[PDB]
Design a protein around this ligand. Structure first.
Ligand SMILES: CC(C)CCC[C@@H](C)[C@H]1CC[C@H]2[C@@H]3CC=C4C[C@@H](O)CC[C@]4(C)[C@H]3CC[C@]12C
Ligand SMILES: CC(C)CCC[C@@H](C)[C@H]1CC[C@H]2[C@@H]3CC=C4C[C@@H](O)CC[C@]4(C)[C@H]3CC[C@]12C
Ligand SMILES: Nc1nc2c(ncn2[C@@H]2O[C@H](COP(=O)(O)OP(O)(O)=S)[C@@H](O)[C@H]2O)c(=O)[nH]1
Ligand SMILES: C=CCN1CC[C@]23c4c5ccc(O)c4O[C@H]2C(=O)CC[C@@]3(O)[C@H]1C5
Lengths: 335, 55, 228, 286
């Protein structure tokens, strides 16, 4: 019935993208100066996790981050002095995401319990306690990012993202449209769009203002495990299990660059950009992260020293730190 | 029910603007070269102002 | 050279390390168990039988028995892709795999064509022969005793397996189901399926699972001491 | 004649290979693998006792060679004290490693909390303290005496010498030959019976092969312990009981007994660390 016209509309979209694609990224950057041999060493190491760390997030003060692990502990790391600020006992032993507020007043975490827990960090009593229990999904909460101090956008196991009013504890819009289990999302710097990648090998841009999808990028093969916006908000990179990262454009809609090596087969768990955006650090699954030149697709360096799977990655806002979490219970701050 | 929804959603998605990929890639290149002096990991800084002093 | 604020930060981090060490010592003694099976077979019933005698998301149940603290991980509320969250259960002590004996001829609720027992067999295949459960022994609780008795006194078992040659008695049929549900694993030296038929015998269930946990704890201690 | 040269060769080769093996064990237990488990701490302490015991061998070897001790009273005082000290520390670390394995196998629910690196550390602390508590009498009571135009520094005793030397010799014998042997035999026997009866190690050819390997390594450990300790302890007790006439045969018997008692500490790293399965797993990593 309508499947044939849907298929020819697919073909029309691909034909429009082919016609609009006139020169690849690597053709114009053929004369750019490469970053060359890069070398980075472990300035700090945050020891104190006793189980499998799955995700972390930085802070906008570029000093305090938060980490989560299988033990059920939410440890706030002072990356300057390598200290512990808080230890929040999670009610769920299974978490694979956490978020840190730009205001710092709130912290979030979620996992196989399908519920996002919110804890208050600047409570008048001086301790940390639950403030709102954001429930309403039907799948595991695989990513969470604070839109601001009163909103969080979350990607869940029920193939739908959801903006959340943190005060009332209810959603305001639902981002249905994934034919596959969504894992990661990333927020635009202007905080009006967010792109989320799912297991159907497609990342979708969404309008945060009303709750509608704008593009879909189907370059990858297996399933999307990571995603991160560019600092200008007009591009993003996707991590996935097909041993390849991909850079996309929100406007040109094509696939700009591919980040793969024929000598590596394992998947990619986390991606984050630097300030300039020339530096994309993809946490691989060969026990280390990989430094990628985001214009030449050249592996500039390697970030080795992890005893287990690399689970999460994040570059701080002022770009002085590469915080790598891992399954071997050791965070490593790099510079 | 989902088939007509995806058809209408992707018909709405199809009729959007697409700027030339040379222009977008040049804008990405310009953003990268215009912030090269600001990125600490691309251009390393001496340990005087570095907040990560090993001990 | 540390000021008062740095001293307070160091003391707070030390206190957090102390409470964290106590919590890790508490949590390195607990016993972790993981429930699987088909959506109707046996998992909520066995955890309901468990909770009735000692007292969405993951359902948890904690209890004590012979000065050993156990844990229940019922993942029945995870209506999603099993592949992307199965790696979160590496450090579990043992797996309680609940299947149904009387599901060999029952037709699955979707498409009215696929068999329930063969679907449970495929699930057991994917769970036994994945990269995350190799050193973890799988307990198997072949439930639905009386229903299986009645349905094999009424109907032949050859409708499920078109190779059955034994009589329609309970012992030979249950032995056939057990051995065919055992030999499917591709690695028999390390994996040790401790099978136990049950319907409502609460005392035997906890003793059997404690025996299996004690065996895998013995194996872990033998790995720790370097003997094995 | 030439018997002293063969004794010198035996002492030299035992000391050299013991220090060689102990140095390899120290290097591989520090740099390659870590000491975050109870058994790693126990093997490290055993290697410490074995290296410290076998370093005093060339001192006694040149003591026999020159027939005199030109190294002063304080040096052989600390040598005798550290010899008794190292012999008890090696004995007690073997005994406590054995009882740790027995607790691990036969008492697993209790070993969930009784087997921690902190508990291993405090057991080693109590080990070396309880060895010091009996090596302290050997400290001040050892002295250098003069006899027959030669210098030797066997330790003396109090004014009633006979029951003092009898009591010290029988205390050393009963402790370091009834505490180790009986406890290690009963503990490894109970462990190997319960390890025969377990479901993981019965019902297949590979399970029986693992059973055979575990019983074999236990038997080799107890066998080399007995072979290295019995011919010297009873020789000491019969030299204390009756007066053996001075003959080259009894002197080379004494030297062979000392050499075997040090071959014990030579072979404990080989049969405790090189045969350990976790150490072999670390070996195959490179
Ligand atoms: C040298 C002799 C004569 C003096 C007595 C020293 C004693 C108290 C020393 C010597 C060897 C030491 C042990 C050597 C190794 C370790 C492992 C380490 O991770 C924790 C401490 C521990 C367990 C030590 C405890 C204290 C110890 C037993
Ligand atoms: C239990 C097994 C290992 C056998 C142990 C053998 C030991 C105890 C044997 C081997 C050689 C023996 C010595 C050989 C020679 C002599 C000279 C003789 O005029 C008196 C006995 C005496 C001094 C023996 C004492 C006991 C001795 C040291
Ligand atoms: N006669 C008999 N009935 C049994 C037995 N065990 C369980 N049931 C029932 O079979 C239904 C399946 O739903 P069930 O809860 O198992 O689904 P699930 O756990 O996968 S979510 C439950 O209502 C149970 O009362 C048994 O031995 N004998
Ligand atoms: C192989 C060295 C072990 N030694 C410990 C101390 C001593 C010794 C041993 C066995 C039993 C003892 O009572 C005893 O005291 C000592 C003695 O009288 C001479 C022999 C020893 O140097 C030797 C073995």
């Amino acid at each position: 019935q309508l499947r044939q016209e849907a298929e020819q509309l697919k073909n029309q979209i691909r034909d429009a993208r082919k016609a609009c694609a006139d020169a690849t990224l690597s053709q114009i950057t053929n004369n750019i100066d490469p970053v060359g041999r890069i070398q980075m060493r472990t300035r700090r190491t945050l020891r104190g996790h006793l189980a499998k760390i799955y995700a972390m997030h930085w802070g906008t003060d570029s000093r305090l981050l938060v980490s989560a692990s299988q033990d059920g502990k939410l440890i706030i790391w002072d990356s300057y002095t390598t200290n512990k600020v808080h230890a929040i006992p999670l009610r769920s032993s299974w978490v694979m995401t956490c978020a840190y507020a730009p205001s710092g007043n709130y912290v979030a975490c979620g996992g196989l319990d399908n519920i996002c827990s919110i804890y208050n960090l600047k409570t008048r009593e001086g301790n940390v306690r639950v403030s709102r229990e954001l429930a309403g999904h039907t799948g595991y909460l695989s990513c969470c990012r604070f839109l601001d101090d009163n909103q969080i956008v979350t990607s869940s196991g029920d193939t739908t993202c959801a903006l959340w009013d943190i005060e009332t504890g209810q959603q305001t819009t639902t981002f249905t449209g994934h034919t596959g289990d969504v894992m990661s999302l990333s927020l635009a710097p202007d905080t009006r769009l967010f792109v989320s990648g799912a297991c159907d090998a497609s990342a979708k841009l969404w309008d945060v203002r009303e709750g509608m999808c704008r593009q879909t990028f189907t370059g990858h093969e297996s399933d999307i495990n990571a995603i991160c916006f560019f600092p200008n908000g007009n591009a993003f990179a996707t991590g996935s299990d097909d041993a390849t990262c991909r850079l996309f454009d929100l406007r040109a809609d094509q696939e700009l660059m591919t980040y793969s090596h024929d000598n590596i087969i394992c998947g990619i768990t986390s991606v984050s950009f630097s300030k300039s955006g020339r530096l994309l650090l993809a946490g691989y699954d060969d026990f280390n992260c990989n430094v990628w030149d985001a214009l030449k697709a050249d592996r500039a360096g390697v970030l080795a020293g992890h005893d287990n799977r690399v689970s999460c990655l994040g570059v701080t806002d002022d770009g002085m730190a590469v915080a790598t979490g891992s399954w071997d219970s050791f965070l490593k701050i790099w510079n | 029910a989902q088939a007509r929804k995806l058809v209408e959603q992707l018909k709405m998605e199809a009729n959007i603007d697409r700027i030339k990929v040379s222009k977008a890639a040049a804008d990405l290149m310009a953003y990268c070269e215009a912030h090269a002096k600001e990125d600490p990991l691309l251009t390393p800084v001496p340990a005087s102002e570095n907040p990560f002093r090993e001990k | 050279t540390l000021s008062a604020e740095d001293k307070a930060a160091v003391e707070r981090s030390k206190m957090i390390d102390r409470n964290l060490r106590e919590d890790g010592e508490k949590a390195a003694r607990e016993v972790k168990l993981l429930l699987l099976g088909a959506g109707e077979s046996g998992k909520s019933t066995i955890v309901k039988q468990m909770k009735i005698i000692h007292e969405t998301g993951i359902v948890e149940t904690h209890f004590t028995f012979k000065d050993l603290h156990f844990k229940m991980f019922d993942v029945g509320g995870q209506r999603s892709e099993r592949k992307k969250w199965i790696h979160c259960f590496e450090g579990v002590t043992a797996i309680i795999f609940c299947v149904a004996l009387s599901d060999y001829d029952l037709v699955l609720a979707e498409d009215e064509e696929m068999n329930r027992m063969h679907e449970s067999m495929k699930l057991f295949d994917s769970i036994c022969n994945n990269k995350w459960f190799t050193d973890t022994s799988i307990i198997l609780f072949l439930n639905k005793k009386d229903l299986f008795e009645e349905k094999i006194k009424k109907s032949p078992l050859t409708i499920c397996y078109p190779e059955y040659a034994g009589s329609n008695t309970y012992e030979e049929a249950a032995a056939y189901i057990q051995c065919q549900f055992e030999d499917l694993n591709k690695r028999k030296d390390t994996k040790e399926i401790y099978t136990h038929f049950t319907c409502a015998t609460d005392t035997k269930n906890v003793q059997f699972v404690f025996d299996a946990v004690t065996d895998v704890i013995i194996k872990n201690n033998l790995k720790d001491c370097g003997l094995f | 004649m030439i018997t002293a040269i063969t004794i010198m060769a035996l002492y030299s080769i035992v000391c050299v290979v013991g220090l060689f093996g102990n140095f390899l064990v120290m290097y591989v237990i520090v740099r390659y693998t870590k000491m975050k488990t109870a058994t790693n701490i126990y093997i490290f302490n055993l290697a410490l006792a074995d290296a410290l015991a076998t370093s005093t061998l060339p001192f006694q070897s040149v003591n026999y060679l020159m027939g005199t001790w030109p190294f002063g009273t304080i040096l052989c005082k600390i040598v005798i004290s550290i010899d008794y000290y190292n012999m008890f520390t090696s004995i007690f670390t073997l005994c406590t490693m054995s009882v740790d394995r027995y607790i691990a196998v036969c008492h697993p629910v209790k070993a969930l909390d009784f087997r921690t690196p902190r508990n291993a550390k405090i057991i080693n602390v109590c080990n070396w303290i309880l060895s010091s508590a009996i090596g302290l009498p050997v400290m001040f009571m050892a002295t250098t005496k003069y006899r027959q135009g030669s210098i030797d520094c066997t330790l003396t005793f109090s004014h009633p010498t006979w029951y003092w030397e009898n009591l010290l010799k029988i205390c050393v014998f009963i402790f370091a030959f009834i505490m180790p042997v009986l406890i290690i035999t009963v503990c490894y026997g109970l462990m190997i019976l319960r390890l025969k009866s377990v479901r993981m190690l019965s019902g297949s050819k590979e399970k029986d092969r693992n059973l055979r390997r575990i019983t074999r390594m236990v038997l080799v450990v107890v066998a080399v312990f007995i072979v290295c300790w019995t011919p010297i302890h009873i020789y000491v007790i019969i030299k204390a009981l009756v007066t053996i006439p001075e003959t080259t045969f009894q002197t080379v018997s004494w030297h062979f007994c000392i050499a075997l008692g040090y071959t014990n500490s030579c072979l404990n790293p080989v049969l405790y660390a090189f045969l350990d399965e976790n150490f072999k797993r670390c070996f195959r990593e490179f």
